[PDB]
Design a protein around this ligand. Structure first.
Ligand SMILES: O=C(O)C[C@@](O)(C(=O)O)[C@@H](O)C(=O)O
Ligand code: NA
Length: 742
């Protein structure tokens, strides 16, 4: 996800790495002040503080500090100390948010005139990075993998600028853009840039970097800090979890909202965790909600133990009169092992059992997934042996039902790429060492009564060629593994799908390499954590070649009767339970992988069942969008209704609205956009999925659910009535003859 950095951090990167050819002034002339500052050392380290007038302001991701009057301008050093004296340590109000002014920046005062002030901004979109310039806006798009033409700067951005400043402005803008790409920024605004006879001064800097690029930018970023939004604090336990996430193929996230709240969550999945938070917010619990976070991607027992013990420690610092509740939730997992993770949580609960009884904690559990029956048994076990109240619920209880149980009372003390991607004839190559996931596909293929396994070969460049044993029914079979992708392709021209399990570090090159083989028309990219600038380049090549990308950061998708991507839908018992071995009439698309297995469950209980599901993944720029898949479903005869599970952030869902108005979409669509709680928070909350950042009022789930409903989409009041509305629509289509069940 993209994360904001402080003005000081941004300026420090700029002073270290922007090309010296632009005439940057006051390089490294800044001084950080916090309550514990040693002013003597400060004057030693920054002797220019004693020899010129100064500007001082807080550096805590407050915007428009000037018009709020949080800027002391043209002061001597003692004028700065007096200016700080009634302000440092004191709380201020900015928007809905209130916090302490704890971090200030002193820089030199730069005399200038209005005419020497300029505005520059660079920001990322799917189609490239825009550059904005304004004297006192001109706009230029640098396309994905293109260069900034310094004569487009002069001819398009600087058309109204004084001719005597154009050459230094163009040099600065060129240098700023190279600086922006190389350090993986996604947003960079300088307002004002001051240009005088003596060179360029950077008076204000706001910026965001793609934090997933750390393995690329380590050296230059150094020990980079990502401040919380104004009105929250940073917590050592958040960094611990961040540290565990860095050491994990799995995803592990934690944000503390109100450490004193009595509602705590430990929910699996980035989607489900937002849905539980939504439900909590609809029942008035938001002010008591202590955290947001999630785990997913199959963490080990030990990782889950370490995550869980962090939560239990945080919830046993002080007592609440009414006790506290721990919501241990999630969807029906595709891939995460419920036994191993819940054994981790159980070990954490035992190790914290004294503090949990003392703080009057009630625990509510709802989970499904692989091995979920053992998991739920050991969960109920530790409740019996510790005497802590633990109320355990499985797949036949609705995902979010434990929330109302727990909160209802205090416990008693342009042409599309392709319409059809998969069929009963699909043959795939799997990139990676992924025996278990491949066996899970062959199991699906067998119970789907396919004539042939869906996996024809595998590629893994870190071993030599060999054959790998799998079971086909109960027969042993062999599947070739190739060191070289070239060998796998020329020996399997029948193959048209590649499922890429490469790690995030190797995913870009392995996917670009696949796209040199025109025989491959669909690629599933599993890995989470690919830098967005790299995904944009994957998107550009795939669009040039006509290749459908599903992912990144997804489990994939499933087509009952025909084909499933990797770990989608999980083990045999969930495939049978949710009847995913044969088709029904309902097609769906979600960002979230975990929630798509919940849709599998919900749709199978309320309809003839799933016809096709896709999870487009959580990243900011998915390889294929909601609309792409909804178009396929509109043009697919066997689909009779469409279910979209949307999400706060971006404006994709409004294309559905337009498709309806234009007459392009005509089957019945059901849609729910998750993230409605985000508006109830006093500070923005970055959810699990990289995409889930709302940049304007229209990107909120609430606005999207409203626009969708006005355009004739069927929208439930909340997620926990989605299953109801899906049922009723199906029933009308049965009553109208459109669907004829078996
Ligand atoms: O454990 C979960 O509920 C989430 C997830 O791990 C899953 O297993 O369904 C999903 O994020 C995935 O990546 O498969
Ligand atoms: Na990780």
């Amino acid at each position: 996800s993209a994360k904001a950095i402080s003005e000081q951090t941004g300026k420090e990167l700029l002073y270290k790495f922007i090309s010296t050819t632009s005439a940057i002034q006051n390089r490294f002339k800044y001084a950080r002040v916090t309550p514990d500052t040693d002013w003597a050392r400060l004057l030693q380290d920054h002797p220019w503080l004693l020899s010129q007038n100064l500007v001082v302001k807080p550096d805590q991701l407050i915007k428009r500090r000037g018009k709020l009057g949080l800027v002391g301008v043209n002061l001597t050093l003692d004028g700065v100390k007096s200016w700080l004296k009634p302000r440092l340590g004191q709380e201020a109000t900015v928007g809905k948010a209130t916090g302490f002014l704890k971090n200030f920046l002193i820089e030199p005062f730069v005399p200038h005139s209005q005419a020497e002030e300029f505005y520059v901004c660079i920001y990322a979109t799917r189609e490239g990075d825009y550059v904005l310039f304004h004297h006192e806006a001109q706009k230029l798009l640098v396309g994905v993998d293109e260069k900034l033409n310094p004569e487009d700067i002069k001819k398009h951005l600087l058309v109204h600028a004084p001719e005597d400043k154009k050459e230094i402005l163009a040099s600065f803008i060129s240098g700023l853009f190279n600086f922006y790409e190389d350090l993986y920024f996604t947003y960079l605004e300088i307002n004002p840039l001051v240009v005088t006879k003596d060179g360029v001064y950077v008076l204000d800097l706001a910026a965001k970097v793609d934090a997933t690029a750390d393995y690329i930018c380590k050296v230059k970023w150094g020990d980079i800090e990502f401040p919380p939004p104004f009105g929250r604090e940073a917590y050592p336990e958040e960094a611990y979890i961040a540290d565990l996430d860095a050491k994990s193929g799995a995803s592990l996230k934690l944000t503390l909202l109100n450490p004193k709240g009595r509602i705590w969550t430990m929910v699996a999945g980035g989607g489900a965790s937002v849905v539980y938070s939504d439900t909590i917010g609809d029942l008035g619990g938001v002010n008591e909600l202590a955290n947001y976070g999630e785990y997913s991607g199959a963490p080990s027992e030990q990782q889950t133990y370490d995550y869980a013990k962090t939560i239990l420690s945080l919830m046993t610092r002080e007592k609440h009169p009414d006790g506290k509740i721990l919501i241990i939730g999630g969807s029906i997992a595709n891939f995460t092992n419920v036994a191993a993770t819940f054994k981790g949580i159980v070990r954490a609960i035992r190790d914290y059992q004294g503090p949990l009884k003392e703080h009057e904690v009630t625990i509510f559990v709802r989970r499904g997934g692989p091995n979920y029956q053992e998991g739920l048994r050991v969960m109920g076990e530790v409740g019996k042996t510790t005497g802590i109240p633990i109320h355990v619920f499985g797949t036949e209880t609705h995902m979010t039902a434990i929330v109302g149980m727990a909160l209802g009372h205090r416990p008693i003390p342009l042409q599309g790429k392709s319409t059809t991607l998969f069929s009963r004839h699909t043959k795939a190559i799997v990139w990676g060492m992924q025996t278990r996931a491949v066996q899970g596909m062959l199991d699906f293929d067998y119970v789907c009564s396919r004539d042939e396994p869906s996996v024809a070969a595998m590629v893994y460049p870190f071993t030599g060629d060999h054959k790998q044993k799998f079971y086909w029914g109960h027969k042993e079979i062999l599947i070739p593994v190739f060191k070289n992708m070239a060998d796998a392709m020329r020996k399997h021209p029948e193959v048209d799908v590649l499922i890429n399990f490469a790690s995030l570090r190797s995913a870009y090159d392995s996917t670009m390499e696949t796209m040199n083989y025109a025989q491959i028309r669909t690629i599933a990219i599993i890995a989470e954590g690919i830098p967005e600038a790299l995904t944009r380049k994957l998107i550009k090549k795939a669009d040039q070649k006509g290749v459908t990308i599903i992912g990144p950061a997804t489990v994939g998708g499933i087509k009952p009767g025909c084909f499933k991507i990797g770990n989608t839908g999980g083990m045999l018992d969930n495939i049978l339970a949710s009847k995913l071995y044969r088709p029904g009439s309902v097609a769906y698309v979600s960002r979230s992988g975990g929630m798509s297995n919940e849709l599998n469950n919900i749709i199978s209980r309320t309809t003839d069942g799933v016809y096709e599901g896709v999870a487009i993944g959580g990243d900011r720029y998915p390889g294929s969008t909601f609309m792409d898949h909804v178009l396929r479903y509109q043009d697919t005869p066997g689909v009779k209704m469409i279910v979209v599970l949307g999400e706060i952030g971006g404006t994709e869902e409004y294309k559905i609205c337009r498709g309806i108005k234009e007459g392009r979409l005509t089957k019945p669509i059901v849609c729910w956009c998750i993230g409605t709680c985000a508006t109830m928070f006093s500070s923005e909350v970055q959810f699990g999925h990289a995409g889930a950042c709302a940049n304007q009022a229209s990107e909120t789930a609430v606005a999207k659910n409203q626009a969708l409903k006005e355009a004739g989409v069927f929208v439930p009041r909340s997620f926990d009535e989605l299953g109801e509305i899906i049922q009723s629509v199906y029933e009308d289509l049965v009553a109208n003859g459109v669907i004829v069940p078996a």
